[PDB]
Amino acid sequence: QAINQAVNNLNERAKTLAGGTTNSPAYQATLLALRSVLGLWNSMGYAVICGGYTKSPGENNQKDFHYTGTTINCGGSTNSNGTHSYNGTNTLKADKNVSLSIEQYEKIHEAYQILSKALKQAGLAPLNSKGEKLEAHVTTSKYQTKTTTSVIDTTNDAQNLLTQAQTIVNTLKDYCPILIAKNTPSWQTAGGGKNSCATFGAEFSAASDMINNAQKIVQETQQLSANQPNSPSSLTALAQKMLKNAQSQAEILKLANQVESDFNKLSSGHLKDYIGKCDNNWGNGCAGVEETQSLLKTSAADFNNQTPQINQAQNLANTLI
């Protein structure tokens, strides 16, 4: 029964870890990766330059992206003193260290709108669940006047929302578009006119890694769920399960901790004073990262604190074999 005692500990910890929310560091780690990317975009997204021609300057490609709230234009620019010009960023070829293309920005806008909608309305599903289904509205404008709205059936499960997150981080980090220059947040009076990966290089790195590690946490949770614990045969089968299951619990806490470390990297530079805040909401994260951060610390420390159970459960298994 001292074995049955450790079995119960492993399960109940695994149930919290894989099926909980408030009290799972796997969950909050995952949520923090997701909410971080959202704040990243709320905090500096508006200053990303987009519109660069793909094929040729002769396309006057141009589109408005709606956040609802505000609208963002790609392609255009402002005429000195007033009016909107239909010639602007679309006048220069798009590439790394210059500009995003309409197509690239619309990938991001779609991901954003989905992340934003999932998190606000359904919430991140417990890692072990297939998730709820929900409908994001993505909305854009053109001239020639045409308004478009895509309604996307989608799910609030970690793997989905993380792909959304990934699409935004990768674009910024692989393409490093220039930021608009000039009230003004610190980084804009300092990085406008210069690529975004020279202002936010560290921050995009940290975000990239949070997505990875969160992804890896999800993997391990799937396969933690795979292994849930009187002859030699039952003593070996459900006992290998113990080793597999404890080894999973540990790795998950390792990654959950690494995410807490990248979050610090994320929020210790130009975004220190902006992500984490809120209140037209552009320019600060408005994403609940502070909430999620303390809860990840708290939960993680609870499990950390229960590391005897896992030490002293792993022995029992090794004893048997």
Binding site: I49, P57, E59, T89, T91, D95, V98, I178, A181, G193
Partner: protein
């Protein structure tokens, strides 16, 4: 000061060179584009330059006799009669506000 342009020389012997100087460039810039005509127009862009990549990418009107400089000057060499007339510079500022200036020169023969 508002964005001027100026041609050196204004009257150009066919076969030779002309330099479109640009006065009052703003110091902080996303990029700029030159065009043939009096207007900013995609299909008549001679060349665009992104400060970001210090990289000049030619548009459809480019004849391969143009060199653009980071002070926005445009040099046109081996000028023909058809190069005569108007040219337009669009400067895009770091804050995505633009400015235009139209330039002109005449090319005569021999």
């Amino acid at each position: 000061m508002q964005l001027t342009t100026e041609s050196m020389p204004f009257n150009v012997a066919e076969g030779k060179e002309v330099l479109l100087l640009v006065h009052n460039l703003p110091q902080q810039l996303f990029g700029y584009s030159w065009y043939k005509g009096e207007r900013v127009d995609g299909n008549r862009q001679i060349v665009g330059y992104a400060i970001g990549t210090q990289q000049a990418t030619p548009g459809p009107a480019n004849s391969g006799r143009e060199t653009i400089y980071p002070n926005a000057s445009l040099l046109i060499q081996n000028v023909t009669q058809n190069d005569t007339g108007f040219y337009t510079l669009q400067v895009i500022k770091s804050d995505l506000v633009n400015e235009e200036a139209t330039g002109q020169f005449h090319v005569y023969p021999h």
